[PDB]
Design a protein around this ligand. Sequence first.
Ligand SMILES: CCCCCCCCCCCCC/C=C/[C@H](O)[C@H](N)CO
Ligand SMILES: CCCCCCCCCCCCC/C=C/[C@H](O)[C@H](N)CO
Lengths: 238, 238, 59, 59, 59, 251, 285, 285
Amino acid sequence: GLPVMNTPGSNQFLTSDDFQSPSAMPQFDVTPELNIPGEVQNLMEIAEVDSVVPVNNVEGKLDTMEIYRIPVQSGNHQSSQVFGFQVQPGLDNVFKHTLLGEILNYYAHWSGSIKLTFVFCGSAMATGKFLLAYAPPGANAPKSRKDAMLGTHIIWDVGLQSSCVLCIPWISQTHYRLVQQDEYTSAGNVTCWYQTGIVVPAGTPTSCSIMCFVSACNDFSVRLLKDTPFIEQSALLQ
Amino acid sequence: GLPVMNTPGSNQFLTSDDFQSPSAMPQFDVTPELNIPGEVQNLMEIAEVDSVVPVNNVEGKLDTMEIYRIPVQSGNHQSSQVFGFQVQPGLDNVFKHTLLGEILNYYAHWSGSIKLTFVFCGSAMATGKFLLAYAPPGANAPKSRKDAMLGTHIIWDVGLQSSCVLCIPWISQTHYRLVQQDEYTSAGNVTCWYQTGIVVPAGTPTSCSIMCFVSACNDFSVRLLKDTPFIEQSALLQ
Amino acid sequence: MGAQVSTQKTGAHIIHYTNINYYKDAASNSANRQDFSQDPGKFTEPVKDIMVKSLPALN
Amino acid sequence: MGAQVSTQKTGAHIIHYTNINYYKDAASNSANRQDFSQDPGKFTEPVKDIMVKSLPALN
Amino acid sequence: MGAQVSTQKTGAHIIHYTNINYYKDAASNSANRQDFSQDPGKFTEPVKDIMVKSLPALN
Amino acid sequence: DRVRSITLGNSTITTQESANVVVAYGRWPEYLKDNEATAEDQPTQPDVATCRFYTLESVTWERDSPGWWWKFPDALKDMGLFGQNMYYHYLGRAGYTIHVQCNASKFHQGCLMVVCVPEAEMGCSQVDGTVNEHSLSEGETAKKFASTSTNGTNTVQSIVTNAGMGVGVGNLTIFPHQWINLRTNNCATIVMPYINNVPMDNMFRHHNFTLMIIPFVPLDYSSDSSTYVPITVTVAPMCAEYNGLRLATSL
Amino acid sequence: VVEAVENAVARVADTISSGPSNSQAVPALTAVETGHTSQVTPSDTIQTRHVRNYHSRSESSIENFLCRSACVYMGEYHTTNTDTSKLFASWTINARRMVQMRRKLELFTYVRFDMEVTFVITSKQDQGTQLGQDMPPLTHQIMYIPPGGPIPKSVTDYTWQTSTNPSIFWTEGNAPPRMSIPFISIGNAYSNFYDGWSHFSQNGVYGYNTLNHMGQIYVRHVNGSSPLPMTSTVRMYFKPKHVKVWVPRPPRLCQYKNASTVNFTPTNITEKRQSINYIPETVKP
Amino acid sequence: VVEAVENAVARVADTISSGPSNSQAVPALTAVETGHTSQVTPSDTIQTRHVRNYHSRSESSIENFLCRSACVYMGEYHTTNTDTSKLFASWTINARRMVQMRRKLELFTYVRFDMEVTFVITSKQDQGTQLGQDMPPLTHQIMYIPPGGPIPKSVTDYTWQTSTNPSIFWTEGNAPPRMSIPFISIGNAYSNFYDGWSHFSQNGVYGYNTLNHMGQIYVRHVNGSSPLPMTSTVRMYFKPKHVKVWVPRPPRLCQYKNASTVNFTPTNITEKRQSINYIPETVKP
Ligand SMILES: CCCCCCCCCCCCC/C=C/[C@H](O)[C@H](N)CO
Ligand SMILES: CCCCCCCCCCCCC/C=C/[C@H](O)[C@H](N)CO
């Protein structure tokens, strides 16, 4: 026959290869294709859908809906910070079980801009203004409205439009950051402060709540597939 | 299937082969190429860069900068030789740890012309002339200026231009010489003598030094890769 | 011989490959790894009246 | 079939070979051994004002 | 695909074969068995003045 | 042919005894362009307030001097608005013009090597130990080589023949470099572009390059010539860019 | 004949340069109550430079996400035993017993594809006081039985004739066996979730086990041998190809309980931290 | 379809004929202080004949210099033991433990390429007083784990399911396994030297170990066997291809000390001789 020679790699089983293989059912006739609504072509399509963030993940609230609600109230509370958290979309407890974090945890590298939407769920007679700020890394997190004022920020005015969008832009020295983030690939923090305060008329509740959604922008991508650490078993039949 | 027949060499691992092989990461997306300064395309490019030669490699100076300095002085010293050494760019102690020698020690055969540059580092008021000579092999090394005068030489006059270049041309019966040189592939020697002498005015130092650089010319090449004898270990984790 | 020649995956800042099909069933063919389409508006913008994004959402 | 025919390495003083790519990724291709370019002036002549080599360096 | 077709060795009183080169070096090619040249006069007739063979050698 | 003038910002350098100028790898500094950028926010470009000559402190070249080195950046983190911009941003980018000055009479003799070394990672004088940040750099003050082997905790192994890196010092000519030969010239000038494996980086965490000054031929003079001979460094950043504005960090 | 096929790579969008602004356009104000996700970019909210982005979303397509071999079953069987049922292994086909592949597939409501099936088979000498023998290489038989086929009773049953069932014979020491399977379901797609019953009176079997019905696998030794006992383990690996999926779903939060149901134990939303303001200090001397 | 590709060989420069001269052109006088290397040839300094030079600089290009397999790791692991951790081998990936490949790569500051990885695996019967058995051929599993993946605890850990991690299974007696790996780094090139810190306060981890982070390798036996003990050794070989390098550096003079640092012991510049004039006599009767 034709003379040949086998190279290293013969007779191995690589679980990510792509070869041709014989069919155990010759000439099988498959069921025709139906046009079902809602066909998915890329995982990033799921990542651009907003989902609610459990910002209030403190002790005693991990199994209640209060985990999603950020509290605010009227009176002089300018010195009190509203919330703050790190920007670690795949590692921090605040973000790792949202849709975006769930998609990221199948991968090792991510890149792109992130959208945070904030919605105010008070009565139609409450007014107020908030300052939403984002600080790139290199310094400690701000401890006052004056320090946070120096970063990338937006001043949200509550009105007939109930939702404001803070965009976190991709500011990084590398093209990609690790999903398992360390000191070297850090990305900074987000904080919120009272810009004026909440004012209400008589006969209205004085305490209110704000909610927060996260999603990915149209410049976002991931790479380097891996197994997720969120599912496990001890034996078969599970 | 198609009839074939296996030849000698099947199922071996040759460490210098070149075959195709399956990828364990299908469709991975690599980081874009950046245009960094200083791209290297050939090892010979490193060999044409001058580097300082430790000509004064005698006992007591192997760990000091004095190993690089050749001493000269005023007065009647015509009978004293300045320096001399063999032309063995990959084997002799004088040359084996310079850039050119370091590149050569990864190879077995070399060919081409060599450049030696000499720079005078005395005060601006010192004058003098030197004779730089190269003798092809076949005889013993000259013992006087008169004998060395008969070889390939240049008479260097110290002036506002501080550097003189002696070129050693490729004179050989074979196309290549062994990096591990023996009697059969010898190449000769270089020597230096006082042509007139060093003269200085009052108020100036009387002793001075000369330095020497080596590099390869534009007709130079090497072949027959091998491992180098300058690095070693006793166990892993080193 | 019914060969197909198509381009390889490379980077940005001799590159094509050939393929032959050997089996009579298309369920024996290798995976389709080089098709990259999207339609995100199906999930992110599923509304009847178009929203401009420079205009206010309501009113 | 997307074959490439190029010349073999020989000496100086029937000589070409053929190649086919089998895999979908270019990281699976064999080494690029037959490209010989140089730019030594990057390291040997990195000066702003050009030096003629027949003229004196200074003055 | 850079194939070569040449004639086979036969006798006297469907006969050709094909070859492909697979390796990048010509030192990997098979032997050159079908080249038959001669120049015997180099050893049998190495004289300055030509000798006719019908004429006497000397005189 | 020997005279030169260099202007940057509101600063100007003249010289009458120069040799030539070295452009590190034939590449002049330049700004980052769009098909090579990754960070998305619009950057700031101060452009005359940062791109100008700053002069460091001088050293005294004695008859027995092994040599000196500086680390860049972090030698310029307290120099005006360049340093202030370094404090407030996460990412920075810049090239440099370096100028070294040392004058002496026609009766002195000596020879200095001036070399720029990218990514000069250094070793500790305890083999199973690591260096402190203070041992690598004292800001605008130079660190000093030794003439013998060194001891001590957390300090750099600084015998001048190995250049703190485990190589032969006479090979440092593979890098961008010039020489100051006291009979020939009195200054050296090197233009260095931005050299990294990423388009931008943090200016506190990473030392981009080291400047080394090493006398190969020691300073020597006779009866009553001047004894005090100083060396001076002056560096100017070029095409400076910053990204990622937030509150000022603190060391 | 050669035919050129052109591949179009799809890279992500660039960012455009943007300057100051003072107008009535309000890109940042929205209303989530509509069910609409805002399509704003950094260029709408800050000042930006122009960037040419070359990144590609190639490794997050469905085909590249799903086309990787994964284990779905492991089983053991002996060469000699006194139980008559420990001499062969058998199971019902699905992808519900190993959690990684199951959870990955369950991000979508409906799926359709072909499969490439690989088997990995290993053997071992059983522990004993008397060891040492000279056995020839062992051979293995794998038979697939669609529903309604006769079932083997032992290792010498006539049913191993495999006249119409597809089988694989294999010898130890060679490369792992492999074959490809087309999309075989009486529906237009496989169903991962089914909120219904098997009986028209709204009772009987609930959920997934009503719809699958894709036969069984049986595996035996062929030698019929072994003076001293030995054990073999077979493992099955699945790889889907030519994929299509519909109707994405939120990923599984609770841990799996069994292979027949979606039953679970209540689990928290995430893990806790000290405070709603807490963020750790990392820049310290 | 066939496509011809033309290869250009690059040979070295010829030498031109040159005669006597008496002029003001001084090719031999230069000034090294400029940082410039003189481009003089023999024809500028002596009288020369014309030579047609046919030599080529083919074997000193970067690709031919670097494209050769080299060992980078060796490890051992047993079939049976009482330590539970000596039954598998594992390590963190780099090229810093074997000095030859390390020094060769370290002539350049930055490098970028693809890799071809080969494994060589051997086994042996452990020394004992009672020898002699009949084992089937041994099988080996190699699994690669990118950072963040679950880590195996033993040889029967669930993590060997390798649902998403790439693995190789192999049997003794066959050709050595092989696979190719693309350029995988979050930067634009691999970095061999890094003069910086991991923490923004200029402390923490110094140098190379800040930037690499490229996962781990685990290797085990598959049979789960061996009445009598046995030992296996695995060795890894790297070969780079499609190479690019930047910023050459002087070669390493001192001997290496560890794999995390550049630490060294002071070493001499070269070895000594008797005198600055000494050259041995070789032409004697
Ligand atoms: C002789 C060896 C033959 C091997 C027989 C293997 C056939 C396996 C059954 C074919 C159907 C498997 C396709 C996937 C099944 C489920 O629909 C999916 N896991 C998701 O629902
Ligand atoms: C299933 C077997 C898979 C084998 C996995 C081998 C992957 C090896 C890691 C890939 C990265 C290696 C590339 C070279 C690494 C370093 O950058 C270089 N040694 C120089 O820095």
